[PDB]
Amino acid sequence: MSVYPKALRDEYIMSKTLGSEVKLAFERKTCKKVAIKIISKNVETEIEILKKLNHPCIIKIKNFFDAEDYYIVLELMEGGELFDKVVGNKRLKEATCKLYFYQMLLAVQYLHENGIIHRDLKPENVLLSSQEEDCLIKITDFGHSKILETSLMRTLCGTPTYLAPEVLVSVGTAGYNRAVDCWSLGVILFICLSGYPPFSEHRTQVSLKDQITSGKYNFIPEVWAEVSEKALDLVKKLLVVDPKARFTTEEALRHPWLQDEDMKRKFQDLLSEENESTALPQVL
Ligand SMILES: c1ccc2c(c1)[nH]c1[nH]cn[n+]12
Ligand SMILES: [Cl-]
C-alpha cells in the first residue's frame, strides 16, 4: 500500500516488524542489524535529545529520515521490551530485578543530571540487549521528554506588586518535575518483583485515580513473602505521594538493596563484553 523513501533504501535493507512502529533493518555498508522506528506524520526535540545524550543505558540514534513519515535508525536491542518479561503475572527473579533496576537508576540519574525528564517510563520503553536474563538494558521513547523553571525564576527577579498568589505558592514545589520519573521507576520495580501492578481496576472498588493520589498500592502478602524486605523498602520510598519527600535516583542508588557488589560486577562485566568490539589500543 506504500514504499520506503529512496534515501532510506539507499543505506538500509528493510526487514521484519519488531514492535507494532519498529522494524528490523540491515545497514548496507556494514551488513549489521539495526532497528528502524517509523513515526506517522516533537520528533525534532526527541532527535536533539538522543544526539546529545551518551550513556550505555540510554538508546543511541544512528540516523534520521524526514520523509512522508519520520524514520529513526537506532541500535538493535535483541532482547526486546522488558514488558514481554513481566506480562500476565510473569515475574523476574529478585537478582534480575536488581541488575535491570540498577541500570534504569543509572540511566535516569544521567537524564536528571543532564536536565532531561523522560515522562513516560514503563516496561515497554525499557529494552533488553539479548535473550539472556543477565543482560544490559537501555531506555528508549524520548517522545514525551522535557528539557528543564526559567519562566518562574525571571518572574521572581522583579517586584511582585502585580504578581498573582498561585505563582508565589508554586515556588514551593518548582523544580521537582523530575520526581515523576522516580514514581514511574517505583511502579516498574513493583511490577518486576511481584508480576502484578500496584494500582489497577482489577478486583477493587476504589478508582485508579484515588489509589494513586492516596498512594495506597495493592499489597498481596503471598506474592511479596518471596521478595526481600530491602527490595520492598525501596519500592515504598519511591511510591511516596509528596514529590519533595520521594526518593531521588541518588537516594535509590545509596539504598541498602543496591549495595550488592556481585550485581555491580555482573553489570561491569556486560559493559566490557559489549565495548570489546569498539575498543581502540590505548596509551599506557
Ligand atoms: C522489539 C521492540 C522494539 C525494539 C526492539 C525489539 N529492538 C529495538 N531496538 C530499538 N527499539 N527496539
Ligand atoms: Cl518499499
Numbering used by the authors: 209 to 228, 233 to 253, 269 to 375, 377 to 512
Reported in the publication:
Checkpoint kinase 2 (CHK2) is a serine/threonine kinase crucial in the activation of signal transduction pathways involved in the cellular response to DNA damage caused by external agents. In response to double strand DNA breaks, CHK2 is activated through initial phosphorylation on Thr68 by the DNA damage sensor ataxia-telangiectasia mutated (ATM) and subsequent trans-autophosphorylation on Thr383 and Thr387 and cis-autophosphorylation on Ser516. In its fully activated state CHK2 is known to phosphorylate a variety of substrates involved in DNA-repair, cell cycle control and apoptosis. In addition, we present the protein-ligand crystal structures of nine fragment hits, all of which bind to the hinge in the CHK2 ATP-binding site.
The binding of compound 11, which is the top-ranking hit in both the AlphaScreen™ kinase and thermal shift assays, is complicated as it can adopt different tautomers. Thus, compound 11 interacts with the hinge either through hydrogen bonds with the backbone carbonyl of Glu302 and the backbone amide of Met304, or via hydrogen bonds of both the backbone amide and carbonyl groups of Met304. Unfortunately, the structural data do not allow discrimination between these possibilities and it may even be the case that a mixture of tautomers is present in the crystal. In addition to the interactions with the hinge region, compound 11 interacts via a mediating water molecule with the side-chain hydroxyl of Thr367, located at the start of the activation loop just before the DFG motif. Furthermore, the interaction with the side chain of Thr367 observed with compounds 11 and 14 (water-mediated) and compound 12 (direct) is also found in a series of potent benzimidazole-based CHK2 inhibitors, such as 2-(4-((1-benzylpiperidin-4-yl)methoxy)phenyl)-1H-benzo[d]imidazole-5-carboxamide (5).
